[PDB]
């Protein structure tokens, strides 16, 4: 539910950049995707609901590690999906797999 999605997808670092000055104090999750990635379209459902829920605390990103190579290489990303969690450019916490449970506790902890 909570259609739609307020989930943009970055288009490169200096686009990941701008979105997180945007987002200012918000919690950010940086969602590392592949269209081929099973366990990442799994999860999708769950993140646009969570986009939605929690629209003036968190900023959903999604960054497609095909098109956004660098973005990947830069977080060291090598399991799919990677949830990585920032705010204010200082990173809280980072976990991998396709886990609903754990990213929203993850979120509601460090709203
Ligand atoms: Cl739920």
Not at 14 to 28: N, R, Y
Not at 46 to 68: G, I, M, P, R, W
Not at 84 to 103: D, H, Y
């Given at each position: 539910?909570?259609?739609?999605?307020?989930?943009?997808?970055?288009?490169?670092?200096?686009?990941?950049?701008?979105?997180?000055?945007?987002?200012?104090?918000?919690?950010v999750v940086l969602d590392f995707?592949?269209?081929?990635?099973?366990?990442?379209?799994?999860?999708?459902?769950?993140?646009?609901?969570?986009?939605?829920?929690?629209?003036?605390?968190?900023?959903?990103?999604?960054v497609?590690?095909?098109?956004?190579?660098?973005?990947?290489?830069?977080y060291?990303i090598?399991?799919?999906?990677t949830f990585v969690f920032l705010?204010?450019?200082?990173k809280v916490e980072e976990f991998?797999?396709?886990?609903?449970?754990?990213?929203?506790?993850?979120?509601?902890?460090?709203?």
């Amino acid at each position: 539910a909570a259609a739609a999605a307020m989930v943009y997808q970055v288009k490169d670092k200096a686009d990941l950049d701008g979105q997180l000055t945007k987002a200012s104090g918000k919690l950010v999750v940086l969602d590392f995707f592949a269209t081929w990635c099973g366990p990442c379209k799994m999860i999708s459902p769950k993140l646009v609901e969570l986009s939605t829920q929690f629209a003036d605390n968190v900023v959903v990103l999604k960054v497609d590690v095909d098109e956004c190579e660098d973005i990947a290489m830069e977080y060291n990303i090598s399991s799919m999906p990677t949830f990585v969690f920032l705010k204010n450019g200082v990173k809280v916490e980072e976990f991998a797999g396709a886990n609903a449970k754990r990213l929203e506790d993850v979120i509601k902890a460090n709203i």
